[PDB]
Amino acid sequence: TRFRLDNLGPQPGS
Amino acid sequence: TRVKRGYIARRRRKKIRFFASSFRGAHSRLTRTIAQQKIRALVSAHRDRDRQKRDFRRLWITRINAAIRERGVYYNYSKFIHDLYKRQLLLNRKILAQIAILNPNCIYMIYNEIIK
Amino acid sequence: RIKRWERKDCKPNSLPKLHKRHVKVGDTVKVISGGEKGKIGEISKIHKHNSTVIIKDLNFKTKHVKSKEEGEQGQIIKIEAAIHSSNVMLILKEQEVADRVGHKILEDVRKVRYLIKTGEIVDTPDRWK
Amino acid sequence: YKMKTHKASAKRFRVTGKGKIVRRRAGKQHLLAKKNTKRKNRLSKLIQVDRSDYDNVIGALPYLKVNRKV
Amino acid sequence: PILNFSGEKVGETFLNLKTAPPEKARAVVHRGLITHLQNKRRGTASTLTRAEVRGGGRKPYPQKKTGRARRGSQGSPLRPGGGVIFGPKPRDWTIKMNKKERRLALSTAIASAVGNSFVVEEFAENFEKPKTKDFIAAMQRWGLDPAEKSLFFLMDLVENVEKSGRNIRTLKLLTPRSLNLFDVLNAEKLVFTEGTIQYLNQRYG
RNA sequence: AGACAACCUGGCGAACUGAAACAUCUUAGUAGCCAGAGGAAAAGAAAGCAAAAGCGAUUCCCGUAGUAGCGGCGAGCGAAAUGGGAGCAGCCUAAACCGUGAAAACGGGGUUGUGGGAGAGGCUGCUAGGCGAAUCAGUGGAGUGC
RNA sequence: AUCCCGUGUGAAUCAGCAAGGACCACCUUGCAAGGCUAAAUACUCCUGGGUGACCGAUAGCGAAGUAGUACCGUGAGGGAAGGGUGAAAAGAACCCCCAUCGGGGAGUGAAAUAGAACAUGAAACCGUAAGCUCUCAAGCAGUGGGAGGGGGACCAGACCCUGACCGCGUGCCUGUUGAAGAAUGAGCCGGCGACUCAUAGGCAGUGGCUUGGUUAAGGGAACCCACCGGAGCCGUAGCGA
RNA sequence: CGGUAGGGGAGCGUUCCGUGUUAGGGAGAAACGCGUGCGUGAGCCGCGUUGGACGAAGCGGAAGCGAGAAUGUCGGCUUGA
């Protein structure tokens, strides 16, 4: 699984 | 980023109106009055569903009482219920009253062999 | 209607604006785009501010001319119309083919508009040279 | 813009090494003859500000380095 | 993993590339994207408050003894014509992030980008004039495909190759000068040069 | 001579407000009026900083710092030097002396800080322009979309 | 203290004068009472070039239409509203009603359920048509039960419209000890219409670094941005005025 | 597991941006009006008519982001008749 502008999100709680 | 409201208002007020579209006069066609009335309709529904359960029972009791008094001159609903539990017999009021309507023969038959 | 917003854009010095355009009046053209595709005609009148040329007998367009003066019938005059330069294109009439126009400096001092694909000159008509 | 310190209050509340707010006691500037030797000794010394009033003191001056015990 | 090579259309695979990413924090790449996007954003949204409006600073009618509700101004934020209560103003959005967090974020996306990644040997000596035709031919040689998206990391970018590369929209040539985090996410296929691998393997290992 | 959006220099100069009232104080030398001028204006080449170690005209940003302080020691007000940058550039004049009465009114002699003087011994850009690659059809108003 | 001023006084000349936060001494620094001087800095009635997690006709300049107009005011001054037939006017020759207006055929057009009052065309409000249904009723108008009647070109103990008659049921909001209230607010319908932003302080959640951490301005084939900039700030010693 | 002030947790939508000049769309999008689907709800989802060209998700982001009350305010239209 490679990082793209599709995949990204924050971590729970930030 | 100006955000016009547009779509979001009357798409819900249609749904508000969909309820009240059997109501009589102003209540059926006036936004804020519909919004005032729908709530009250739902409240009277919720309130009367619990009134239902006791009121049907109360009807049934009267039916059964009316049925049973036509047997002996002094025999009466109050005694009848205790005579059922004396013999251990778990027929609820609904069944008893509805058979009393639809098949009075069967109430005659239950009355006959409870006494002994 | 005439439409109020949509008119000749005046410059600062009270004059309408114009477009360079590939076409001139003394010219034969094939239509690339629109309803009358492929038909071959000539340019007659030329509205500069729109980039719209008027081809003789092409935009066949009916018109119900009401009687002007007397108690008579008038008649339905089938007239031409305008047509946008981008839709038209420059035909050769040797190979009878369209083109896309280009300029070149000739031995004769003047600058002229040759074609591509049978690059033959299109500059000796109307007033002429 | 960047918080001004409440330099009226600041001058009555110092903070200690471990981080507690400390004040001086009230009473012993004048009319001393009529008080005892005893009570002037208790009025000489510093103690903590009461936990109730920390809120106002910290709120007044916001560059203290003050540790409510955590 | 280990990367691939290409002399000029033919493989001879070697260089490895070691780089340092985190473990259970993709959130770092997300944050590094968001910061990038925020700091760029121009922020030219401007409205007038009831002060700034061109309008009459006067009571229209008296406070008492008319059935009308008490009015302050006609350019009031309840009438149309001048208001906009908490409306946007020419506002900057530039947030900080640390150095090492940015650098780590750049490292992680690259680390996860090997798999799709690619390397070549220098090819700046081919292009005498600028030619897009030959460039696209070399793309189809390597198999990068004018349809898909690509990012050419090129440690020392040459004139003639840059100019030929310019007009391919899907393509995107990058020096270490204009290295970008958005772009390394943007690309489908990365394609390095031997020097680039020395640079990144040194600087982020 | 008048005109001129703001910015700027100089003159005059409020009050509501804050202080839970209010007069010191704050609002503020702000708003307003008045006069003046430029593309910027004002400042500016030490009778200056600083401490026994040093710096070298201004002006602007970061900082020191909400620190030193001031304050019905209340509300509040609030620096600078050291340090990092942006940008740098330095000049002329009067008298003591000289000449044509003499402070009749003109030229020369000099103007400097860990003391200085004179005296006597065509080049490019802008204001017009110019040349400038490569596609065709099916698609039922119209095709660049399929 | 330093700097400048009205009133009155009133020096000295580098063996001098002034400053070093009263003041005196000693050091150090400078030379007041004549002038001039680019840059970095401030701004937008305005011109050119670029950009927009800006507006889209109740928005955006007040002003998308010959707007500071119409209009009001003695006067200073205040101050509106009103965009979208079509690709192309092809804007309806002719016939009928007929003095006009307008209308129906015709014709044009992809469309005239685009005809100039013309594009999408919501609600209130005004009707026309069909299904059921009120003239011994009493009612915040619904709700639970449901008589009798009607369906939908799709064969259901299913579903929808009406609703004989029964039982229950004191409009909403604000704001009160307490409001069906004869306390307040709204004629109705649609739009606009309110805890925001900048900078700091505390706290929590999350992340990075922990060889302590972090850079500010400022520099970047601008803005973001690699990559520099360690000047400062926070933590590493308290105690006492 | 009643609940006003009030605190805490979990969500839905609105326009705009990244992905995206995505697929989906003049064999019909946005809208507009109807549904004998769904959800605890805010809301979602399919429909063929009117409509005549825009533009879903999903993963993320940002606000002029949700209205019935302000003798609110602008426009329309009633009542009294």
CSV table of C-alpha atoms (C1' of nucleotides) in Angstrom, one decimal, chain F residues 5-7 38-41 43-52 55-64 83-93 113-115 141, chain G residues 2-3 13-20 26-32 34-45 87 109-110 216-219 229-234:
chain,number,residue,atom,x,y,z
F,5,A,C1',-7.7,58.8,-3.4
F,6,A,C1',-4.5,57.4,0.5
F,7,C,C1',0.4,57.9,2.7
F,38,G,C1',6.8,64.7,-2.5
F,39,G,C1',6.9,60.4,-5.0
F,40,A,C1',7.6,59.1,-0.8
F,41,A,C1',7.8,62.6,3.5
F,43,A,C1',14.7,62.0,10.0
F,44,G,C1',20.4,62.1,9.4
F,45,A,C1',26.4,62.6,9.7
F,46,A,C1',27.6,62.5,17.2
F,47,A,C1',28.3,68.5,22.4
F,48,G,C1',25.8,60.3,20.5
F,49,C,C1',25.9,55.1,22.8
F,50,A,C1',28.6,52.2,26.5
F,51,A,C1',31.7,50.7,30.5
F,52,A,C1',37.0,50.2,31.6
F,55,C,C1',30.8,50.9,19.0
F,56,G,C1',31.0,54.5,15.0
F,57,A,C1',25.0,59.2,10.6
F,58,U,C1',20.3,58.0,9.9
F,59,U,C1',15.5,54.8,8.9
F,60,C,C1',12.9,49.9,8.8
F,61,C,C1',12.0,44.3,10.5
F,62,C,C1',13.3,40.2,14.3
F,63,G,C1',14.6,40.5,19.3
F,64,U,C1',15.6,41.8,24.2
F,83,G,C1',22.5,40.5,19.9
F,84,G,C1',20.5,39.0,14.5
F,85,G,C1',19.1,41.2,9.9
F,86,A,C1',17.2,45.0,5.4
F,87,G,C1',20.1,49.0,3.4
F,88,C,C1',24.6,52.0,3.5
F,89,A,C1',27.4,57.9,1.7
F,90,G,C1',28.8,61.3,3.0
F,91,C,C1',29.1,66.7,2.4
F,92,C,C1',29.1,72.3,2.3
F,93,U,C1',29.4,77.1,5.2
F,113,G,C1',38.8,64.5,17.7
F,114,U,C1',41.5,59.7,21.8
F,115,G,C1',42.5,68.4,19.3
F,141,G,C1',-31.0,21.6,-34.3
G,2,U,C1',18.5,64.1,29.2
G,3,C,C1',15.3,67.5,25.1
G,13,U,C1',36.3,79.1,24.7
G,14,C,C1',39.7,73.8,24.0
G,15,A,C1',44.8,75.3,31.4
G,16,G,C1',37.6,75.3,27.5
G,17,C,C1',32.7,73.5,27.2
G,18,A,C1',28.7,69.5,27.6
G,19,A,C1',27.2,64.3,28.6
G,20,G,C1',27.7,59.7,31.3
G,26,C,C1',38.2,61.4,39.4
G,27,C,C1',38.0,58.8,34.7
G,28,U,C1',35.7,58.0,29.7
G,29,U,C1',33.0,60.0,25.5
G,30,G,C1',31.8,63.9,22.5
G,31,C,C1',32.1,68.7,20.4
G,32,A,C1',25.6,72.4,21.0
G,34,G,C1',24.7,77.6,10.4
G,35,G,C1',23.0,74.5,6.6
G,36,C,C1',22.4,69.9,2.6
G,37,U,C1',21.9,64.7,1.7
G,38,A,C1',20.1,58.7,-2.1
G,39,A,C1',18.6,53.8,0.0
G,40,A,C1',16.1,50.3,2.8
G,41,U,C1',10.2,52.5,5.0
G,42,A,C1',4.6,54.1,4.5
G,43,C,C1',0.1,54.0,0.9
G,44,U,C1',-3.7,53.1,-3.7
G,45,C,C1',-8.2,58.0,-7.1
G,87,A,C1',-27.6,28.9,-32.3
G,109,G,C1',-37.8,26.8,-35.3
G,110,A,C1',-34.6,21.3,-32.2
G,216,A,C1',12.6,34.8,14.2
G,217,A,C1',13.3,38.2,10.9
G,218,G,C1',15.7,37.5,6.5
G,219,G,C1',17.5,34.8,2.0
G,229,G,C1',19.7,31.6,8.9
G,230,G,C1',21.1,29.2,16.4
G,231,A,C1',20.1,36.0,16.9
G,232,G,C1',16.8,34.7,20.7
G,233,C,C1',13.2,31.5,23.6
G,234,C,C1',12.0,27.3,26.7
